[PDB]
Paper text:
Dystrophin is a cytoskeletal protein belonging to the spectrin superfamily and is responsible for linking the extracellular matrix (ECM)-binding dystroglycan complex to the cortical actin cytoskeleton. Actin binding by dystrophin is mediated by two portions of the protein: the tandem calponin homology (CH) actin-binding domain 1 (ABD1, residues 1–246) and a series of spectrin repeats (SR) in the middle of the protein comprised of SR11–SR17 and referred to as actin-binding domain 2 (ABD2; residues Phe1461–Gln2209). The ABD1 of dystrophin is a member of the calponin homology domain superfamily. CH domains are found in a range of actin-binding proteins and consist of approximately 100 amino-acid residues with a characteristic α-helical fold that includes a core three-helix bundle and two flanking helices.
Residue numbers in the entry: 13 to 244
């Protein structure tokens, strides 16, 4: 349940969702389009709201300066970072590029989205509180019993139940239960979240309806849902 090709795809979809939020250009390849250090600075500009000027020049030292600026901003935001140096990003290291993007997603999409609730509940484990939120929210949906952020989501019922429990107005639950295809249920939830909740479709059905669902991708998407669903 730690799947790196799926992570490449879904993390890139999240990065481009941020860029869509700010009207900037999308990236096409996560292991090439971050090397010059510019688009990382664009992403951190969008996330921090601060201007992060780029170095001028097309040599390796300018990319290294850009990435050093990005890493200094991350450390200034108390971000939990992987063991990384600027050269690892400039030179296209796959695992550490994925790991930096995951550090960013976890800091902003997960921890920061959930920070006020966690300070209220006086809890620190983000996964425990998010799992409890899903479980309590879907307690009265009988086809749903979420115990993890992987296989509990594969048949598409838990996602539709999480959406429905916070917005019972959007659809009739029995219409989803009557869908025998987990692909149709997953697409149904994805389309609701995309067009009625403003969440980019970070996940494909095959990223969830699969033998080993990627835990980080699902956690990312579920915390984005937590970010936009009403919890009055």
């Amino acid at each position: 349940y730690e799947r790196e090709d799926v992570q490449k795809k879904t993390f890139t979809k999240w990065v481009n969702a941020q860029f869509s939020k700010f009207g900037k250009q999308h990236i096409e390849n996560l292991f090439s389009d971050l090397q010059d250090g510019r688009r990382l600075l664009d992403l951190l500009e969008g996330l921090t709201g601060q201007k992060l000027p780029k170095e001028k020049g097309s040599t390796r030292v300018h990319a290294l300066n850009n990435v050093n600026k990005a890493l200094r901003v991350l450390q200034n935001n108390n971000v939990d970072l992987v063991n990384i140096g600027s050269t690892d990003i400039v030179d296209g290291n796959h695992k550490l590029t994925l790991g930096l993007i995951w550090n960013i997603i976890l800091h902003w999409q997960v921890k920061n989205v959930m920070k006020n609730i966690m300070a209220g509940l006086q809890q620190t484990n983000s996964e425990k509180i998010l799992l409890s939120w899903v479980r309590q929210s879907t307690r009265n949906y009988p086809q749903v019993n979420v115990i993890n952020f992987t296989t509990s989501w594969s048949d598409g019922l838990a996602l539709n139940a999480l959406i429905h429990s916070h917005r019972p107005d959007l659809f009739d639950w029995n219409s989803v239960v009557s869908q025998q295809s987990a692909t149709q249920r997953l697409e149904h939830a994805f389309n609701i979240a995309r067009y009625q909740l403003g969440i980019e479709k970070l996940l494909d059905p095959e990223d969830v309806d699969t033998t080993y669902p990627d835990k980080k991708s699902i956690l990312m998407y579920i915390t984005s849902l937590f970010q936009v669903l009403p919890q009055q």
